[PDB]
Amino acid sequence: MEDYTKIEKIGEGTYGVVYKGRHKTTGQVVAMKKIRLESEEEGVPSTAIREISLLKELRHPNIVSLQDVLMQDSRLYLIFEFLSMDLKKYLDSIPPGQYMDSSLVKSYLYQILQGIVFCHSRRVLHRDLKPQNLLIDDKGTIKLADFGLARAFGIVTLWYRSPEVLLGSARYSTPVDIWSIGTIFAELATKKPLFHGDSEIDQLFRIFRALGTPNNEVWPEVESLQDYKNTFPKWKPGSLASHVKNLDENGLDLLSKMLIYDPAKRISGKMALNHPYFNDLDNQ
Amino acid sequence: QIYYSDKYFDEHYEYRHVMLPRELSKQVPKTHLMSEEEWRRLGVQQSLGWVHYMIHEPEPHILLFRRPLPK
Ligand SMILES: Cc1ncc(-c2ccnc(Nc3ccc(S(C)(=O)=O)cc3)n2)n1C(C)C
């Protein structure tokens, strides 16, 4: 549309190029995601523009509001509030020796859970959550970006992925986002990724080495999954607190509940918000 | 080039995975584990007695190895 002016590139997302821009009427600064639309078969209607319009109606202070949607010349433009920093970048600005302020960790996790509960209550998953998708303003508010874009289209990524998905489960649901928030919680505290694997298989082995190799005793039906093996290495459960620092006993309890193997037994977003860890929560 | 992981261990075995380039991966059997003679023909170089113990099907280029600890 003629209403906006590109300033500069900010990056590449999975789905297309992302620019910083200004609205000519309001003067507001925006993020503009360009997407080249794939050619489609005649007599097969597209869900993609329909599903994207639905996401425009999601409003919540801790998600990145999709302000508009344009279509010029078989290209789709998504317009968002511009935020100039993400969590990956914020963690990089902290020098060696320093750690993230204990109260700001709590605040951020609270905000993240608020946003994920909002999405989950409206039947919407992220599926692909990670520090690059968590944006921050200068005033210390944090928001999810790219919620529901995965479903709308598709048919560092690995570290935040859940064991359901890695072992090849037929189906998955809201618990995948909770596992990811788990691994991000640990990173906020320590500055470094909890499960720093070099491949799918190495990612599993790092999860096993910290939480125990799963069997049917701790995770019903796991031994039936497509990529389970009786030959995996065999580490015993326990010693999560040796992999993480700067968390009181509540923090460690919540974290361990976000990282339960069985999706059915894993903590929900609602329940996590009522956990004791948040009792002493702070201004901002 | 071929990349060799650091070692990790169990109560019973020691372990180590090896990542081959993707053009060699079409040469690794999609049906059976490999003899020490077989994996040396792909240019995997390490000490005697490592055993090819499993295949993660999504990553056929990753050879997983295992050797029993002595008692
Ligand atoms: C994939 C996607 N679609 C829409 C956005 C999006 C939405 C709103 N604001 C921003 N701003 C932004 C993000 C990261 C960085 S940086 C260079 O510090 O990494 C700099 C500015 N971006 N995004 C993001 C997640 C790229």
Residue numbers in the entry:
A (entry chain A): 1 to 155, 165 to 293
B (entry chain B): 5 to 75
Manuscript excerpt for this entry:
All CDKs require binding to a cognate cyclin partner to remould the kinase fold from an inactive conformation to one capable of phospho-transfer. We have used biophysical measurements and X-ray crystallography to investigate the ATP-competitive inhibitor binding properties of cyclin-free and cyclin-bound CDK1 and CDK2.
AZD5438 binds ∼170-fold more tightly to cyclin-free CDK2 than to CDK1 as determined by ITC measurements. Through its pyrimidine core this inhibitor makes two NH and carbonyl L83 main-chain hydrogen bonds, while the aromatic core is held in place by interactions with CDK1 F80, L135, and A31. The phenylmethylsulfone moiety forms a potential hydrogen bond with K89 through the sulfone, while the phenyl ring sits up against I10 and is stabilized via an intramolecular interaction with the isopropyl group of the alkylated imidazole.
